Symmetry: C3
Subunit: 199 residues, 3 copies
């Protein structure tokens, strides 16, 4: 226990894990749209407290939604609409979302959860929105009298990124891996970096 | 009262009406922009709790704002700005909105309210925003300690649609009618489907 | 004190100042992006209660953020991200914002604060978000049980403007000055109109 360099390295990584999972940290969502030409569109949003994406897609063959490990899985919500942005046939009969958390698989590296994935192939246009709330183990209510304005400001402060990659290989090499992001490729292989209590 | 098929049909329609008007249901807004070439741009937004649209328009001849019957008319707000998105001449003297609910006409079919319309012709660019809150007969406050985060998530989950139709006839046939939407055409004719207690 | 025209003129201006600073009034933010060809992109957002902008920029040489005098400087927050919209190297170690209010200079005309400026030159792409909350001297909490829905509606009602000007001279003449906006040019000269207790 006299290897201070070893101890600092472990603490360096754990701190990252734990900061992300605190209420001071990010919650992140990615939407991946897969096209028949093998290219992939990603939209990412990163924000405090809660985060979401809402976009319309020209026919993808498939969609993968990934959240960061800092999401509360139980609060995940998805509105998947038709070509005119109606969630369920007609507005009059539409619940504005489905709570799809049960369908999310854990993306794991070395036994650690690096994210959560929901993947679905499709049978024109879809409108798709997805939302999740940052984990909060604690009693402190972020939407209190005292903190609600900070949540309002987080809506302004959320950062969006959107790009198209020509191939999943390009996505893995130039997007997922440089940025320490979680991912699940078509061969069901998990990508990500485990940090908690690790060197 | 032994025509169960008749009873189920009536209940099927009433349930739709009532679901829409519950707090589990959609509130919807449409902005229609009318151009001198007779084409029409629609923006629609559909969300839980509250909904709005905010866009800038190259000179339309006219604007029609329609809300679903699930809006609370008294909470309707509109910010109509100039070419640089200032609501009232100068920011220093601008109230950020006007409460225009009194100007909304009921769109009715068979005596039932299928929506609310505000229509105005214009005398360059306008910036236009409009907002409304879902009806709530009940005592339950959606923006409480316990439910405010769900309202935050509804901002992420809101679905937008935007298209241009070449003629009002095309709008009526391919947009309004296929989707059971309320509408008021230039001849003041009402479109929509009455559901409450109806077969 | 029998010059009623003089008294009304002074009151006319003071009322504008004071209305802006009330909770009924606007809070405004501008982002200015400066390019090597000498052109300038402005984004402006105007809303009640709180306001923000979030955009990605192809390499500007510099950024100036200006807020209206109705902002509370202490609540200003900025997220400046990399090319993939991450605020601080990696999501796991990112605080979603910095509170940069201390760096803001007062833009003054005739001793009156007409706005606040933060200016920074840059060493590809940046993602940039900025947010601020309208001043509230009073005890009344805008995000209360009773008023939180109005804050939700202000998110719908916020108006955005975006344009490119070819030169700072064009910005000053055609954008800042016609609209009584505050500004600080490259020569450190202040623009704006003083209103409080002034003729």
């Amino acid at each position: 226990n006299r290897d201070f360099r070893g101890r600092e390295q472990r603490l360096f990584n754990s701190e990252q894990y734990n900061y992300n999972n605190s209420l001071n940290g990010e919650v992140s969502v990615w939407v991946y749209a897969y096209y028949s030409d093998g290219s992939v569109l990603v939209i990412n949003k990163n924000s405090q407290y809660k985060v979401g994406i809402s976009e319309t897609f020209k026919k993808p063959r498939a969609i993968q939604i990934i959240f960061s490990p800092s999401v509360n899985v139980r609060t995940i919500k998805m509105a998947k609409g038709n070509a005119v942005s109606v969630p369920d046939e007609y507005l009059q009969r539409s619940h504005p979302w489905e709570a799809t958390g049960i369908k999310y698989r854990k993306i794991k590296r070395d036994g650690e959860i690096v994210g959560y994935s929901h993947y679905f192939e499709l049978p024109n246009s879809i409108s798709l929105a997805v939302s999740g709330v940052h984990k909060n183990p604690s009693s402190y209510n972020v939407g209190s009298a005292h903190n609600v304005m900070d949540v309002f400001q987080s809506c302004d402060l959320a950062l969006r990124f959107c790009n198209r990659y020509w191939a999943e290989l390009e996505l893995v090499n130039h997007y997922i891996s440089p940025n320490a992001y979680p991912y699940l490729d078509i061969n069901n292989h998990s990508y990500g970096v485990a940090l908690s209590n690790r060197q």
